């Protein structure tokens with residue numbers, strides 16, 4: 094649960110006294126929100142719940158006033174479960190199961206995305222009055238996003254289906270090494286947005302998606318992206334009382350808020366070492382296979398002046414020979430029972446865990462700050 | 475639970491008349507065991523629970539008298555839970571967390587594997603009388619034969635009761651000779667142990683046997699090669715017990731996955747989106763190197779047109795893709811796609827990413843006399 098020391102690492106050390114565990118700094122989320130409002134004041138964040146759905150994480154973003162981008166009936170139910178109103182929810186999954194569409198309608202959720210005519214046929218039969226946002230491609234592109242040269246036809250069909258199209262959205266992804274992708278997407282969005290107005294639609298939403306860095310270390314900084322985004326916005330979507338700009342950041346808000354502590358449960362010496370820890374690719378580190386993550390092990394032990402360092406490998410618990418976390422990283426000699434830390438483990442980690450081999454995912458502990466007493470009391474319930 | 479039907483397909487059709495679901499034929503497991511006893515009469519199977527720990531699957535294997543290979547306190551707890559005695563359990567994980575070793579001890583489980591001296595130092599402090607089995611290499615696990623003498627000498631210093639040798643060739647074999655080589659290598663280590671005075675009486679040949687009677691390297695061919703090697707290096711003897719840790723062998727073909735087409739896009743090719751994917755049942759594609767084949771559950775029509783098509787999972791991940799280019803007849807949203815041979819390393823590696831829930835499991839039992847009664851009454 095909640096512990097003290099108002100620094101995630103002191104709380105973690107204080108805690109250490111052999112099961113793996115997370116220390117999540119809810120206070121880091123508050124800080125990320127302050128930076129969002131400062132760098133993207135025109136954009137309302139709808140947190141991508143899929144990135145990390147921990148209840149304290151959702152309760153925190155909710156009290157900070159963010160919206161939520163949900164992808165299934167389960168996520169909508171989770172968000173509505175903590176008392177968040179349906180207007181603060183966007184169903185941003187382009188290809189939805191009919192019964193899930195029915196659940197959203199019955200829950201009061203009306204904004205959804207789509208990227209082809211087939212989806213509109215479903216909405217027509219199931220949630221006729223839904224406010225639909227057309228998601229365009231950013232050349233993940235093979236899977237979702239209508240090509241710009243197909244949008245006129247798609248909108249025509251929407252008119253025939255009597256669909257209330259109200260915006261345009263896109264998602265560049267996190268694999269960009271240049272913010273220019275956002276500028277080009279915002280330009281394409283203007284073109285489709287105008288086509289909708291041309292055909293008689295009430296276009297009032299621009300959704301710029303996710304893909305913003307969650308670790309203030311990455312090559313392409315958040316600030317540089319916000320600058321490129323703001324300029325494209327000024328040029329193609331000048332401020333207007335009928336226009337609302339939103340985004341679906343997921344990793345941006347939580348990547349750096351979670352630090353994982355694993356225990357060295359076994360060791361082999363060969364001059365190199367092999368450490369086995371009690372979390373791996375089937376657990377928290379599934380992010381390595383599914384999210385292309387690269388991790389760095391950090392000894393929890395306070396360093397000793399001139400310790401010798403050796404080429405080491407770190408392995409998960411599992412029988413699988415592919416369950417390897419680190420291939421060759423320099424670490425001082427570790428002892429079974431000591432701990433290794435992994436920072437920036439808040440995004441696409443706990444949500445992709447499985448109980449393969451019967452191992453249980455790490456318990457999550459919390460440290461908090463930057464929030465009112467009454468809100469903390471809600472987070473602790 | 476149990477579905478009305480004489481077949482998997484028959485049961486499927488019944489039920490269908492849109493959440494994804496599994497139909498597991500417990501009867502296919504019974505037949506795999508019969509085939510095992512026929513081709514490997516000298517080898518006692520200890521089912522690798524990690525492969526698929528479904529409660530009915532375990533109860534069935536248990537009634538068939540198999541043993542169980544467990545990898546954590548959780549799996550030991552589960553097998554002991556259905557009433558299996560500790561002696562029919564082998565803790566086959568080479569690098570165990572201390573509290574887990576302690577748990578096995580307190581549960582009466584004494585046979586454990588190891589592949590280095592450090593693991594023995596832990597055992598000596600937590601489970602001093604455990605019967606230890608030395609696992610040899612065939613880079614994550616397995617001691618090299620060249621290093622076994624030193625390891626055995628250290629085990630004697632730690633007063634460890636080393637009782638055998640084990641190995642695991644894995645599923646990636648195009649040649650059964652790999653089993654012969656591993657059995658030969660095990661003889662070398664068995665002898666070093668006897669020479670140092672250990673009571674070597676267990677040979678554990680591991681897993682890796684095919685679970686789908688279609689694979690290139692057939693189970694019977696492997697059994698033949700194993701039996702010849704066993705005769706040459708480990709002649710019958712009442713003091714010697716030969717065991718194995720088959721996993722996929724027993725359950726791969728027992729499960730059929732039925733998923734629903736929830737969205738479709740046309741480009742003359744089609745893109746279908748189903749309600750299970752790489753984060754769910756198809757995690758096996760990423761973790762187990764599996765290849766799947768979608769089958770329309772719809773009864774075919776004469777000369778239907780077939781088109782190159784892709785199948786995608788329900789998730790936001792552009793990598794959540796099941797099939798790249800497979801010829802299927804035009805499908806409609808709401809229609810079902812079946813995936814056969816989905817019992818191994820599927821339900822165990824599932825996650826609830828994007829909030830999607832894993833498919834529920836239903837059971838049927840074909841080709842068996844009213845033994846069906848026994849299995850359904852557990």
Ligand SMILES: Cc1ncc(COP(=O)(O)O)c(CNCCCCN)c1O
Nearest residue numbers: 141267303304341342343344383384790
């Ligand atoms: C439509 C959509 N909207 C938001 C996000 C969040 O992305 P993020 O980089 O800010 O966290 C996504 C993410 N999609 C796939 C993530 C896969 C991670 N391995 C999205 O599709």
Ligand SMILES: Cc1ncc(COP(=O)(O)O)c(CNCCCCN)c1O
Nearest residue numbers: 412413522681682719720721722761762
């Ligand atoms: C030590 C050991 N024993 C048995 C098995 C079961 O193998 P199988 O091919 O017969 O099912 C294993 C397998 N471990 C890893 C499976 C990963 C699947 N992606 C094993 O290590």
